[PDB]
Design a protein around this ligand. Sequence first.
Ligand code: 6CE
Ligand code: CL
Lengths: 112, 115
Amino acid sequence: GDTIFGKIIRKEIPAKIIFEDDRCLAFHDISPQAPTHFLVIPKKHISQISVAEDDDESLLGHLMIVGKKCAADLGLNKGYRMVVNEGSDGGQSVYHVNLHVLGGRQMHWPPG
Amino acid sequence: RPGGDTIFGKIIRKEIPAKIIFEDDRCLAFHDISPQAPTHFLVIPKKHISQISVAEDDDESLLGHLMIVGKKCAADLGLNKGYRMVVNEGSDGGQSVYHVNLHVLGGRQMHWPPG
Ligand SMILES: Nc1nc(=O)c2ncn([C@@H]3O[C@H](CSP(=O)(O)NCCc4c[nH]c5ccccc45)[C@@H](O)[C@H]3O)c2[nH]1
Ligand SMILES: [Cl-]
């Protein structure tokens, strides 16, 4: 089923885009939890990490490499936290795989 | 020594004990000694990478493999209601061991924000 992130990929609703390529999109989160809080998502609709296939390995790693490169470009020189949520207990809010990157403040422990 | 001399390199080489869940030629999954959830484990590469901010472009498949292994281990451990994956970078991220590691936390409701 389509999600709001599909609409963002298709440019049907606005988002503040940080980076795009042929296979992923990075954009600022609409409900930021840190001074910098953005998402990196694949253009392929994988609904949740639990259903990712083995052949998706390089794509998932691509999200992390894009995320760390975007974090550097956004000035997160003191560090950041990357998060993927799965399901109800994980607090997943949109059923399209999305890598959160949060920084610009001290991130605390436990991570939720 | 392959893997480095952080605690995680020692664990990779069986020089310090750990409760191992899964092991292959690229990574190792093992339980966290200070769990923050009823199930809390780590997935680490066997290749030493100090932190995600210095990972190389050719590390993409390895980093993705950590997540695939993480989700497969989570299923094997019965985390059917979900879980959260975390990577900490640098001081603001809360990094304390400079060997890349992916946390998997589940068995309770995780809250927002994630720290
Ligand atoms: N099985 C096992 N054996 C060990 O010898 C050992 N030593 C550390 N750890 C666990 O590694 C995990 C990952 S380190 P990180 O850089 O993501 N910082 C994570 C927050 C953080 C900042 N400072 C800290 C101090 C203590 C614990 C966590 C913290 C932590 O969650 C340790 O618990 C171990 N696990
Ligand atoms: Cl989410």
